[PDB]
Design an enzyme around this catalytic site. Structure first.
Site, PDB file in Angstrom:
ATOM      1  N   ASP A 138       0.770  -1.236   0.000  1.00  0.00           N
ATOM      2  CA  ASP A 138       0.000   0.000   0.000  1.00  0.00           C
ATOM      3  C   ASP A 138       0.816   1.311   0.000  1.00  0.00           C
ATOM      4  O   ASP A 138       1.505   1.619   0.957  1.00  0.00           O
ATOM      5  CB  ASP A 138      -0.907  -0.008   1.231  1.00  0.00           C
ATOM      6  CG  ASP A 138      -2.344   0.356   0.915  1.00  0.00           C
ATOM      7  OD1 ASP A 138      -2.622   1.500   0.476  1.00  0.00           O
ATOM      8  OD2 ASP A 138      -3.209  -0.505   1.150  1.00  0.00           O
ATOM      9  N   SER A 144      -7.053   4.563  -2.867  1.00  0.00           N
ATOM     10  CA  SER A 144      -6.960   3.095  -2.846  1.00  0.00           C
ATOM     11  C   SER A 144      -8.029   2.360  -3.623  1.00  0.00           C
ATOM     12  O   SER A 144      -7.764   1.282  -4.167  1.00  0.00           O
ATOM     13  CB  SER A 144      -7.045   2.555  -1.428  1.00  0.00           C
ATOM     14  OG  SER A 144      -6.174   3.295  -0.571  1.00  0.00           O
ATOM     15  N   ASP A 171     -11.655  -2.860   3.883  1.00  0.00           N
ATOM     16  CA  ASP A 171     -10.875  -1.799   3.273  1.00  0.00           C
ATOM     17  C   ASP A 171     -10.872  -1.844   1.757  1.00  0.00           C
ATOM     18  O   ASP A 171     -11.113  -2.881   1.144  1.00  0.00           O
ATOM     19  N   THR A 179      -8.569  -2.007  -0.707  1.00  0.00           N
ATOM     20  CA  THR A 179      -7.813  -3.038  -1.401  1.00  0.00           C
ATOM     21  C   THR A 179      -8.420  -4.444  -1.368  1.00  0.00           C
ATOM     22  O   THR A 179      -8.685  -5.035  -2.431  1.00  0.00           O
ATOM     23  CB  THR A 179      -6.347  -3.023  -0.938  1.00  0.00           C
ATOM     24  OG1 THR A 179      -6.020  -1.682  -0.516  1.00  0.00           O
ATOM     25  CG2 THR A 179      -5.433  -3.397  -2.077  1.00  0.00           C
ATOM     26  N   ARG A 231     -16.514   3.373  -1.000  1.00  0.00           N
ATOM     27  CA  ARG A 231     -15.670   2.532  -0.175  1.00  0.00           C
ATOM     28  C   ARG A 231     -16.063   2.603   1.297  1.00  0.00           C
ATOM     29  O   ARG A 231     -15.667   1.739   2.073  1.00  0.00           O
ATOM     30  CB  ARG A 231     -14.221   2.972  -0.338  1.00  0.00           C
ATOM     31  CG  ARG A 231     -14.005   4.453  -0.127  1.00  0.00           C
ATOM     32  CD  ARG A 231     -12.585   4.821  -0.327  1.00  0.00           C
ATOM     33  NE  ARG A 231     -11.732   3.972   0.491  1.00  0.00           N
ATOM     34  CZ  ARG A 231     -10.427   4.160   0.646  1.00  0.00           C
ATOM     35  NH1 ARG A 231      -9.827   5.173   0.038  1.00  0.00           N
ATOM     36  NH2 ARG A 231      -9.724   3.323   1.419  1.00  0.00           N
ATOM     37  N   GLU A 287      -1.836  -7.954   0.802  1.00  0.00           N
ATOM     38  CA  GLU A 287      -1.647  -6.521   0.910  1.00  0.00           C
ATOM     39  C   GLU A 287      -0.906  -6.095   2.165  1.00  0.00           C
ATOM     40  O   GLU A 287      -1.258  -6.500   3.273  1.00  0.00           O
ATOM     41  CB  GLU A 287      -3.018  -5.839   0.880  1.00  0.00           C
ATOM     42  CG  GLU A 287      -2.982  -4.325   1.065  1.00  0.00           C
ATOM     43  CD  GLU A 287      -4.194  -3.812   1.801  1.00  0.00           C
ATOM     44  OE1 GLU A 287      -4.842  -4.611   2.512  1.00  0.00           O
ATOM     45  OE2 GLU A 287      -4.497  -2.606   1.688  1.00  0.00           O
ATOM     46  N   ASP A 336       1.241   2.372   3.734  1.00  0.00           N
ATOM     47  CA  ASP A 336       0.484   3.564   3.361  1.00  0.00           C
ATOM     48  C   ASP A 336      -0.084   4.337   4.543  1.00  0.00           C
ATOM     49  O   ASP A 336       0.029   5.565   4.592  1.00  0.00           O
ATOM     50  CB  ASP A 336      -0.663   3.173   2.424  1.00  0.00           C
ATOM     51  CG  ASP A 336      -1.637   4.292   2.213  1.00  0.00           C
ATOM     52  OD1 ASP A 336      -1.318   5.169   1.385  1.00  0.00           O
ATOM     53  OD2 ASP A 336      -2.707   4.295   2.879  1.00  0.00           O
ATOM     54  N   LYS A 337      -0.739   3.624   5.459  1.00  0.00           N
ATOM     55  CA  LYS A 337      -1.346   4.251   6.625  1.00  0.00           C
ATOM     56  C   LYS A 337      -0.293   4.962   7.461  1.00  0.00           C
ATOM     57  O   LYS A 337      -0.512   6.078   7.925  1.00  0.00           O
ATOM     58  CB  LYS A 337      -2.113   3.209   7.440  1.00  0.00           C
ATOM     59  CG  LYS A 337      -3.139   2.466   6.573  1.00  0.00           C
ATOM     60  CD  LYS A 337      -4.340   1.879   7.332  1.00  0.00           C
ATOM     61  CE  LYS A 337      -5.690   2.344   6.760  1.00  0.00           C
ATOM     62  NZ  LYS A 337      -6.638   2.971   7.771  1.00  0.00           N
ATOM     63  N   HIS A 381       0.999   8.043   5.726  1.00  0.00           N
ATOM     64  CA  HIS A 381       0.017   9.077   5.972  1.00  0.00           C
ATOM     65  C   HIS A 381       0.328   9.695   7.317  1.00  0.00           C
ATOM     66  O   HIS A 381       0.471  10.905   7.434  1.00  0.00           O
ATOM     67  CB  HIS A 381      -1.380   8.461   6.049  1.00  0.00           C
ATOM     68  CG  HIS A 381      -2.051   8.326   4.723  1.00  0.00           C
ATOM     69  ND1 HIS A 381      -2.248   9.374   3.853  1.00  0.00           N
ATOM     70  CD2 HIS A 381      -2.551   7.232   4.101  1.00  0.00           C
ATOM     71  CE1 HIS A 381      -2.834   8.919   2.752  1.00  0.00           C
ATOM     72  NE2 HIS A 381      -3.041   7.622   2.848  1.00  0.00           N
ATOM     73  N   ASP A 387      -0.527   0.384  -5.156  1.00  0.00           N
ATOM     74  CA  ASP A 387      -1.675   1.047  -5.749  1.00  0.00           C
ATOM     75  C   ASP A 387      -1.374   2.470  -6.219  1.00  0.00           C
ATOM     76  O   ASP A 387      -1.922   2.919  -7.223  1.00  0.00           O
ATOM     77  CB  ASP A 387      -2.844   1.033  -4.766  1.00  0.00           C
ATOM     78  CG  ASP A 387      -2.414   1.344  -3.357  1.00  0.00           C
ATOM     79  OD1 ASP A 387      -1.221   1.649  -3.158  1.00  0.00           O
ATOM     80  OD2 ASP A 387      -3.258   1.279  -2.441  1.00  0.00           O
ATOM     81  N   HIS A 388      -0.498   3.178  -5.512  1.00  0.00           N
ATOM     82  CA  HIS A 388      -0.142   4.555  -5.883  1.00  0.00           C
ATOM     83  C   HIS A 388       1.043   5.010  -5.055  1.00  0.00           C
ATOM     84  O   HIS A 388       1.272   4.492  -3.960  1.00  0.00           O
ATOM     85  CB  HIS A 388      -1.311   5.513  -5.607  1.00  0.00           C
ATOM     86  CG  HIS A 388      -1.736   5.525  -4.178  1.00  0.00           C
ATOM     87  ND1 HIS A 388      -1.048   6.177  -3.181  1.00  0.00           N
ATOM     88  CD2 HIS A 388      -2.712   4.828  -3.550  1.00  0.00           C
ATOM     89  CE1 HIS A 388      -1.591   5.854  -2.008  1.00  0.00           C
ATOM     90  NE2 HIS A 388      -2.613   5.032  -2.165  1.00  0.00           N
ATOM     91  N   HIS A 416      -1.163  11.026  -0.954  1.00  0.00           N
ATOM     92  CA  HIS A 416      -0.684  10.150  -1.995  1.00  0.00           C
ATOM     93  C   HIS A 416      -0.138  11.073  -3.068  1.00  0.00           C
ATOM     94  O   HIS A 416      -0.362  12.272  -3.029  1.00  0.00           O
ATOM     95  CB  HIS A 416      -1.834   9.395  -2.619  1.00  0.00           C
ATOM     96  CG  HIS A 416      -2.669   8.641  -1.641  1.00  0.00           C
ATOM     97  ND1 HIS A 416      -3.921   8.147  -1.925  1.00  0.00           N
ATOM     98  CD2 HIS A 416      -2.396   8.245  -0.375  1.00  0.00           C
ATOM     99  CE1 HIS A 416      -4.350   7.483  -0.857  1.00  0.00           C
ATOM    100  NE2 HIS A 416      -3.454   7.513   0.111  1.00  0.00           N
TER     101      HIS A 416
HETATM  102 ZN   LIG Z   1      -3.469   3.250  -1.424  1.00  0.00          ZN
HETATM  103 ZN   LIG Z   2      -3.544   6.190   1.668  1.00  0.00          ZN
END
Ligand SMILES: [Zn+2]
Ligand SMILES: [Zn+2]
Ligand SMILES: [Mg+2]
Ligand SMILES: [Zn+2]
Ligand SMILES: [Zn+2]
Lengths: 444, 444
Positions: free
Chosen positions: B46, B97, B148, B150, B161, B317, B322-323, B326, B364-365, B407
């Protein structure tokens, strides 16, 4: 490995965003060659990491677009470009322009600021040098001053990238000072190496006078003269050139310092995406049509160099992508990335017709720019741009509270095409490049 | 196509920093295959871009080190992942996501926030759904909430989502609300999807009761059971499972929300690399020895799924990279990247033994983190870390003034190993991934 990687149709529909038209396995297999490279062209996009390539494409060609040159190389990978700490010998994760250029041209890591020397200030031969040795022709083009790190790494072995000419060397690189028995300043060592084709800016330094050796008293330009160098100063005289060799080497200085950037656009600012209108890049009026474009220089250089039967090694640098990234100017940065793209198209066209040419496009290190959402309230400099898609793209520069946005240590894309391009695939190290080029040419 | 991409010796000496011991040509040639892939493992990290992979590597293995998993996949390339604007239908350069997840699992771009639906809100079959119809076994494991973006993208088609269970769906995706005659929330559609192996966290949503259908009044956890699901809540019970199939599907809920992160360390701060001393991560004391690790979950899934004669599709995943990015928390982010790498190793080991498995690792990004120089006086959040090299590394998070870092839209790395892996090399779109897998597996 279909060489057309733009979205295949309506990006809102199933399968319309796809770039692949089929199974590459067959095609990639057919793009893998063990055979020796006859020629080599290395295109360095200064500060061109994946974020710069992405942002420039989104703007120029639209998100689903595709750079005909930059994006058209079949073999891809990513590579590490960390430098060394002079004292401790430990890694310094964020390289500068000189420490990095030294590695692909030399094959040995070094401290930031060093040109052609390891951490022990010991000299190591560059690939332009070995090439010239083996008999090949050599060229070095750039849109910055030739004394800059990227073009200089190929020809000079100095202790500090700042020793451009006699004046600075005597005091920053005293041990390289000609009067101190050293090889001389960057400009002097450049004039000694005598690559067949050298084009860029930095004419100002050539006005300094040498202090020792035969040509003492004479400015570096006069020395260029006395030594058989043809000097051109514009697009015109450049096409006027018909040959460039060891007795007729060409030397083009198209600017005092660096050449002018192609696009003009305001500098990113704090909350610029919020408090300021989206911008559309326009051409740069300060740039004259007599100043040749990178693609023109690449073209002419390829033209003059392709006469030597043994082959040639050519290095082209889209210098200012890094410049404007530091300046927080999305338009200058993007214009420059498009400019390099044209340059790569010319390389790829010759390479494709010739057959034994290895083309490599990459950058020396990552940089600041990031593509963020349109509604971002970021701590750095931002700006909104009107992309080709008719959409707004917002770029962000947020790693420096000083006048200049810093580089970054993330690994970046490296792509190649031709004989031996398979070695650019996977994770490699910037130094591997030097070894990859040297064996494709069979340099020894 | 080497498996050891570590620096080869003393990084201060010539060729000592090299990662290539030879010429990849034949090695790669030998890895190009178009034979049908019987199985597929897609490991998604992620928000794990090239900057995230570099920082973790610089840290855990040292600049010249290399991930035995993440860095050992021979075929590489970069892919784009822009989303679409719901109204205009134009690109939205920075995806979230859900849109991204939806792109690789369906083959169609969509606006941000959507799960399983295009911009017109039409559902499209996911690769998990097509694998199951073809007789293959299916597995979805994640370190975060199963509801989530993903993991959900593979089993749900929802317009937001945020439509986790019965409640949220009633008021955000009423058209999907079971009462309104829709398929239901993400949790409800997940239980209907019935993959053989489903593992992650997010058990707190299973505590809501359905509003209609056969199991109205019953909690989703009870419905899970009632429908013949095996429920494992910790490592012990997980390892105890003998079989997972359509009549005996496995549901593992290891945490109320997301599973706990591996490492601990303070959050980056304004001028953190200046006012503060270097940090060294430590393991998270909150993590119960009983919570299985991604590698462990990846292993079991592979074990249970590798029993279906037709083959299988598994998606893993590393959610918290990612989290944590962030949350501007290096230690958690790097830790989570080290976590995905172990799982990758488990996948690759199986892949090399079996020989007909296609393994793909990507993200994903791109995200916010940057590796900046030690003296960087950044405008956002920074922190210094003590890397394996005994060198100091600074990380910058400077794209948001909110409490969350964002992101980014830069194209990022994608690597694969096995049948059809050549379809990753070069520039491709995130949607192409869907088609690559579909073709690799032979799904019609
Ligand atoms: Zn993501
Ligand atoms: Zn994110
Ligand atoms: Mg440069
Ligand atoms: Zn640079
Ligand atoms: Zn720079």
């Amino acid at each position: 490995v279909l060489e057309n990687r733009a979205a295949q149709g309506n990006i809102t529909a199933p399968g319309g965003a796809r770039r692949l038209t089929g199974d590459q396995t067959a095609a990639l297999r057919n793009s893998l060659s063990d055979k020796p490279a006859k020629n080599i062209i290395l295109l360095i996009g200064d500060g061109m990491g994946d974020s710069e390539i992405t942002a420039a494409r989104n703007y120029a060609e639209g998100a689903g677009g595709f750079f005909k040159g930059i994006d058209a190389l079949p073999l891809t990978g990513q590579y590490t470009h960390y430098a060394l700490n002079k004292k401790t010998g430990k890694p310094d994760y964020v390289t500068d322009s000189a420490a990095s250029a030294t590695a692909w041209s030399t094959g040995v890591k070094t401290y930031n600021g060093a040109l052609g020397v390891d951490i022990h200030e010991k000299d190591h031969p560059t690939i332009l040098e070995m090439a010239k040795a083996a008999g090949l022709a050599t060229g070095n083009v750039s849109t910055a001053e030739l004394q800059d790190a990227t073009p200089a790494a190929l020809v000079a072995h100095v202790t500090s990238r700042k020793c451009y000419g006699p004046s600075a060397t005597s005091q920053k690189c005293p041990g390289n000072a000609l009067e101190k028995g050293g090889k001389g300043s960057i400009t002097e060592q450049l004039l000694n190496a005598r690559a067949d084709v050298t084009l860029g800016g930095g004419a100002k330094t050539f006005a300094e006078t040498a202090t020792a050796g035969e040509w003492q008293g004479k400015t570096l330009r006069e020395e260029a003269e006395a030594r058989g160098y043809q000097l051109v100063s514009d697009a015109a005289s450049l096409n006027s050139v018909t040959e460039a060799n060891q007795q007729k080497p060409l030397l083009g200085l198209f600017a005092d310092g660096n050449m002018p950037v192609r696009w003009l656009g305001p500098k990113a600012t704090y909350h610029g995406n919020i408090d300021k209108p989206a911008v559309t890049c326009t051409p740069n009026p300060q740039r004259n049509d007599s100043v040749p474009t990178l693609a023109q220089m690449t073209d002419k250089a390829i033209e003059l160099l392709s006469k030597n039967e043994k082959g040639f090694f050519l290095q082209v640098e889209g210098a200012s992508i890094d410049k404007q990234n530091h300046a927080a100017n999305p338009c200058g940065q993007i214009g420059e990335t498009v400019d390099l793209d044209e340059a790569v198209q010319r390389a790829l066209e010759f390479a494709k017709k010739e057959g034994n040419t290895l083309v490599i496009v990459t950058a020396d290190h990552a940089h600041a720019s990031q593509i963020v959402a349109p509604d971002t309230k970021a701590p750095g400099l931002t700006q909104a741009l009107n992309t080709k898609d008719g959409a707004v793209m917002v770029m962000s520069y947020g790693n420096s509270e000083e006048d200049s946005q810093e580089h970054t240590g993330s690994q970046l894309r490296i792509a190649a095409y031709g004989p031996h391009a398979a070695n650019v695939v996977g994770l490699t190290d910037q130094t591997d490049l030097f070894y990859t080029m040297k064996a494709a040419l069979g340099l020894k």
